[PDB]
Every structure is written in structure tokens, then in C-alpha cells.
Amino acid sequence: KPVSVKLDADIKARVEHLAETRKRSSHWMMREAIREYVEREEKREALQQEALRAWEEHQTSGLHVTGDEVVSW
Amino acid sequence: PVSVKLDADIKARVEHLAETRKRSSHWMMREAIREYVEREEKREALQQEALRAWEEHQTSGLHVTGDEVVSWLESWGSENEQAALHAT
Amino acid sequence: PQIVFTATALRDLERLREFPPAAQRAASAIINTIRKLESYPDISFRELLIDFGDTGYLAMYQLTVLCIRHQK
Amino acid sequence: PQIVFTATALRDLERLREFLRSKNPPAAQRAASAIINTIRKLESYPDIGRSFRELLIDFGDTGYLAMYQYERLTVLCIRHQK
């Protein structure tokens, strides 16, 4: 399912230069660059949700802490 | 500029991700390539300095054995440490 | 600051505890981490670092509300 | 194989050492063991990576990257910080 992307020129030049070296296609080039991005942000914004769910559980209940001295657990 | 890319199901994970962190799908994709080419240009750099390092070793011919640096390394952090020599 | 801890961060510690000097080892790395937070909270919240020995852990927080500390 | 280091790999080790000082409290002795493990696992099953390949050496905070070649003495060239 093709989709157009406006490139910053100068990069496209750096994109196409690494394609000369690696002896691969400028298309498969970015074809990975998109995967490795989401393949990383999918996990990072997955643990963001974990910590964000903890905030939801606190912002609606009690808690303890001080220092090695619990209070309202 | 203005050239097109085509992905498969991955674009769905993109468009879904380009909605969670509420960002532009078209923007996100671009950051991907920059981060990529930046990382990947640094990999191409490590290649040559690796490749060069060799070319120097093949010409110079000098080296150190793993045992010597194994000998060196086992004294790291234990006050009386050591150095490294250079055999030919 | 008051240096608070969440339930999700509390159970992430009990997860930790289970896993040889360690009983009194990694505990010291967190009490250091705890008390340097009582002064320097660093700085959108940032879950701080944590390193002792084998590998390091990840205590995310925001009172400094400490929510979730996963193994990285 | 002979497991040989290059001059470039020795001084990547030197940079490395002189660093850890201001790096991990006692991970100097922790990084050292990781390399000797990587050194003597090259002495045996010599392979891994990506016509020579690379090899990652993991220890504590983060890890480094050994690069090496070959047919009877895996010359070890370059170990930068990744």
C-alpha cells in the first residue's frame, strides 16, 4: 500500500549515499528505517503506559512511603 | 524530494502509534529515516576505522596476544594493575 | 520532597527481593537512590537510573511519587 | 586460533580503562572479566556477528563492540563504545 513522503532533500542525499555503499535499494533502505523506529517506540510507549497506569492507580487511592517507614498502604 | 515508500502491516502499527502519542504519521516516518541514517552513517564509520585498523596491522605486523591482554585485564581495579606491551 | 512510593513500585521491589551478598547489597543502592532524590530530584517526569553489580534497574517517578521500577 | 589484538584494539582498551575510573565504582574488574570471557570464547567457538564479523561484550551499565577477523589467528581489531 504505497504512500508518498516529502524528504528533506539533503537527507535523501545521505539516504542514497549509504545505499551505494551497502549495495541495496533506497526503497528497502527506509523500509527498515520505518520498522526499526516503530519496533523501538512500540516498546518504549508500551512501558510508558505501564508507568502511566500506576499514576492512575495512585491518583485514585492511598499510598505510603516516607523512608523505609510506610504509612497509608 | 517527495518520493514514496510502501510498507505492509507495519504502516498500521505506525498509524496506530501515530495516534497514541498523537503525532503526525508523515512526521514520524521522517524522524525514522534521520535516526536511521545517523546511526547507520556511524556504523559505516566504525566499519572503515575497523577496516583501516586492519590495513595497519597487516602492514605493521605488530600485535599483542589475547593472553597478554588477558594477563593485563585480570589486574584491573586491583590497585597493582598492569599495562600492555607490544610484541612483533 | 516527601519521596513517596506507589503500589506498582512497591510490588516491583518485592519482585526484586526474591532474586550471596545481595540481601544487603542492592538495598543499599536504592537507599542511596532514595536519599539523593530527597535532595536532587533531577528532572514530563523522568524515571531515574540504578546500577549495582550484575545489571541495573529503572525507578520511574514524578512529593516525588515513585511509580514502577522495572528491571530494564 | 591465536586470539590476537591489534594496536587499535589495545588503545581502545586503554581509552576504555582510563574511563571506567570515572565510570562504574568497581566495574573496572567487572568489564575485564567480560572481555576475558569474550577472549577465551573466541579461543574456542570463534564466531558471531556480521568477510569478517563483529561481537558484542555486555557488562553492567551497557556494552561494547569487539570487531575481529578470520584462518588461524582471529586478529582482534577495534573495540569502540557502541
Author numbering:
A (entry chain B): 5 to 77
B (entry chain A): 6 to 93
C (entry chain D): 2 to 20, 26 to 49, 59 to 77, 84 to 93
D (entry chain C): 2 to 51, 59 to 78, 82 to 93
The authors write:
The proteins SO_1444 (ParESO) and SO_1445 (CopASO) in the CP4So prophage from Shewanella oneidensis were recently characterized as a typical type II TA pair, with an important role in CP4So maintenance after its excision in host cells. The toxin ParESO can severely inhibit cell growth and cause filamentous growth. The antitoxin CopASO can neutralize ParESO toxicity by direct and tight protein–protein binding. CopASO can bind to a DNA motif in the promoter region containing two inverted repeats (5′-GTANTAC (N)3GTANTAC-3′) to repress the transcription of the TA operon.
The crystal structure of the ParESO-CopASO complex was determined by the single-wavelength anomalous dispersion (SAD) method using a Se-Met-labeled protein. The structure belonged to the space group P43212, and was refined to a final R/Rfree factor of 0.29/0.30 at 3.80 Å resolution. There was a CopASO homodimer binding two respective ParESO molecules in an asymmetric unit (ASU). The resulting heterotetramer adopted an overall very open, V-shaped architecture with the organization of ParESO-(CopASO)2-ParESO. The antitoxin CopASO is composed of an N-terminal RHH domain (β1, α1, and extended α2) and a C-terminal toxin-binding domain (α3 and the extended loop). The two neighboring CopASO molecules dimerize via the RHH domain to mediate the DNA binding. Notably, the intrinsically disordered C-terminal domain is induced to fold into a partially ordered conformation upon ParESO binding. Moreover, the conformations of C-terminal extension in the two CopASO molecules are distinct, and part of the extension is further folded into a helix (α3) in CopASO (I). Structural analysis showed that the toxin–antitoxin contacts were mainly mediated by the C-terminal domain (α3 and C-terminus of α2) of CopASO and the two helices (α1 and α2) of ParESO. Remarkably, surface-charge analysis of CopASO showed the C-terminal extension was predominantly distributed with negative charges (such as Glu54, Glu60, Glu61, and Glu86), which perfectly complemented positively charged regions in and around the binding grooves (such as Arg18, Arg22, and Arg90).
